[PDB]
Amino acid sequence: SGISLDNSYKMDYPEMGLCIIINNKNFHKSTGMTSRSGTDVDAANLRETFRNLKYEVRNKNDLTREEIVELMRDVSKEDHSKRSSFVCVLLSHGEEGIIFGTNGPVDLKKITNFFRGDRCRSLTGKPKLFIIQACRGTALDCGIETHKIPVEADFLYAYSTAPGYYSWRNSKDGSWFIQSLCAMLKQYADKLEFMHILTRVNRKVATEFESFSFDATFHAKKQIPCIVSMLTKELYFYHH
């Protein structure tokens, strides 16, 4: 046969893969965490978006920290041999390196570790995408006028906000990040490589959104998503 290039992930397996969406809206009173109004819009937007990308979507709502860990562990034990990739979307409260279950914290590292190259062999060499809509701290952006492979390889963490910053969510339209991500995937998934789609998501969030709050401290704030890529190849959702 002719010259062959290995610069893009093989996305023509019988199945695209699983898309696990963990949607935490209601938290136990004991935690003191507020309800995340608008997150259901995000969950629905994501379900439709990934359905059109041919992913086997599994929506999970209001999971405890124990349920999140159990779910991810079970999913990592499945046979992903016929799947091209794996996607996990986390919608909840959070801190740097932490995502909140309805009853408490879950170390993000604990979740992702289940899918490490040496722990989930059927996903070795395949893109493992983690889309995270959650705060990464308490800072506000005021803006400005106008042989072997690493076990950590092939992971992509699409964070909604910069490290150490709050992440914004509109109670009616959903989070700024998820709204933008779904819109860009809808328009460009059959045309652009994933990093280029995420770059347009960064531009959309950075330019089209600004907070409105009755509290001056939280008013007129901005947000820039953070793409963290350990991917080793170009990722196109389409093939042929």
């Binding site: 507020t34 995340r36 705060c135 909604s160 992440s167 939280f218």
Partner: peptide, 4 residues
């Protein structure tokens, strides 16, 4: 608008 609310924070997460």
């Amino acid at each position: 608008d609310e924070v997460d």
